[PDB]
């Protein structure tokens, strides 16, 4: 039985989102990539550094926005910029949201030597795609 | 097992005697069925009566149908005769071993 990146069935009381509800094999068919950069393309380089940056950024954001991110974080690498798009709950105060956004922007930018932007889309709650 | 062999012999004789007459049924009697042998399952769960088949396919099918329909009546007749105090269900199985010999001799001729 495949235990990899799947949500096992339960009594039906377990809500799950689009990503959690889609399994790996559907990738590139029903769900796209959570990180969009040119490292892995044919003839390019720095795939390992792109992967390290992705992992570090994801952990950074998860720890920065505890119980606030309502969906996985979409990373885009246009030119040298970085765009982190997040779906966040409308549970934390807007002032705190803006401060965290600016702080993370500046710190990540200085850390990785490239402009960074964070774009938050707020929702009343995590978007249920089905119940399991 | 010697007991099983004796049971097979007695059942073969009894079934031949039964089929010798219209006792089971006039329809069955008219078919003139000939029994090749009788074999009892090792656990005594069934009694297979191997009957010789004829060349005609429709005749074979009709004989099989009649035999299947009359198996229970034959079992009852045996248990009533007391040839055996207990008789398992009777199953009629087609026998076709002699076809090889027949067609051999045809070709060899």
């Amino acid at each position: 039985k495949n235990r990899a990146a799947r949500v096992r069935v339960s009594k039906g009381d377990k809500p799950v989102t689009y990503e959690e509800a889609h399994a790996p094999h559907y990738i590139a068919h029903r769900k796209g990539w959570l990180s969009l950069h040119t490292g892995n393309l044919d003839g390019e380089d720095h795939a390992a550094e792109r992967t390290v940056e992705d992992v570090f950024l994801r952990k950074f954001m998860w720890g920065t926005f505890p119980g606030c991110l309502a969906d996985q974080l979409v990373l885009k690498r246009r030119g040298n910029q970085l765009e982190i798009c997040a779906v966040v709950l409308r549970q934390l105060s807007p002032h705190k949201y803006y401060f965290l956004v600016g702080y993370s922007e500046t710190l990540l930018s200085y850390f990785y030597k490239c402009p960074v932007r964070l774009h938050l889309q707020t929702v009343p709650s995590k978007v249920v795609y089905k119940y399991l | 097992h010697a007991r099983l062999r004796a049971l097979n012999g007695l059942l073969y004789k009894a079934l031949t005697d039964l089929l010798c007459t219209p006792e089971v049924s006039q329809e069955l009697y008219d078919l003139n069925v000939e029994l090749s042998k009788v074999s009892l399952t090792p656990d005594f769960s069934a009694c297979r009566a191997y009957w010789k088949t004829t060349l005609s396919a429709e005749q074979n099918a009709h004989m099989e149908a009649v035999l299947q329909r009359s198996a229970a009546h034959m079992r009852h007749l045996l248990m009533s005769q007391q040839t055996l105090r207990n008789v398992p269900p009777i199953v009629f199985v087609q026998d076709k071993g002699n076809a090889a010999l027949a067609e051999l001799d045809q070709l060899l001729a």
Partner: protein, 202 residues
């Protein structure tokens, strides 16, 4: 098979297509009309419409093939045919007028008659009741057995350094004349069937 079940095997026979409509029966007319709608598989590379096509010889070639060297298989087959013809020509030239009539010279006729002579009427299968029992053979099995027996006999190591064409030609002539180890093998099979006659009721 990449061919879907809808695909039908192609029919390669000019006469079947040239037959007049009038001679066709209603069933044949319906079959011809139906085939216009079905899917036909692409023809195998083996068979064509040549008037010199022999399916029996093609099958013997395929059986004699090892590992996909169809070229060598065909070479051996044609060489055997030529050798048989050469031997028959020599015999005809060395034979008087009366014997010349009885002497055959067609390699294909000799080939097919020898295979027919080597076909086994009956073959023994294990029957369960296991007992080796004389049992009739289907025609396909008889032909296949004849071909395999001829090939095996020609592949026997008893022939030292002799080439496959010469060996096969000699064995083919022996079978054609109802002699040789292949005929002996058929007779042995028949004798075993006769001896196991008693066990046929199984």
């Amino acid at each position: 098979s990449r061919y879907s079940p809808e695909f039908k095997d192609p029919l390669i026979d000019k006469e079947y297509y040239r037959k007049p409509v009038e001679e066709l029966t209603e069933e044949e007319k319906y079959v011809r009309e139906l085939k216009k709608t079905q899917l036909i598989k692409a023809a195998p590379a083996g068979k064509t419409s040549s008037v010199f096509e022999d399916p029996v010889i093609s099958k013997f070639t395929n059986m004699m093939m090892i590992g996909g060297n169809k070229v060598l298989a065909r070479s051996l087959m044609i060489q055997t045919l030529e050798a048989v013809k050469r031997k028959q020509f020599e015999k005809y030239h060395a034979a008087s007028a009366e014997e010349q009539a009885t002497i055959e010279r067609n390699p294909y006729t000799i080939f097919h008659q020898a295979l027919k002579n080597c076909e086994p009427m009956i073959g023994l299968v294990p029957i369960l009741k296991f007992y080796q029992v004389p049992v009739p053979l289907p025609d396909r099995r008889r032909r296949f057995l004849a071909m395999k027996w001829m090939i095996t006999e020609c592949r026997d190591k008893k022939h030292q350094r002799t080439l496959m064409p010469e060996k096969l030609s000699h064995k083919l002539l022996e079978a054609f004349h109802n002699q040789g180890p292949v005929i002996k093998r058929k007779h042995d099979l028949h004798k075993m069937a006769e001896a196991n006659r008693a066990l046929a009721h199984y």
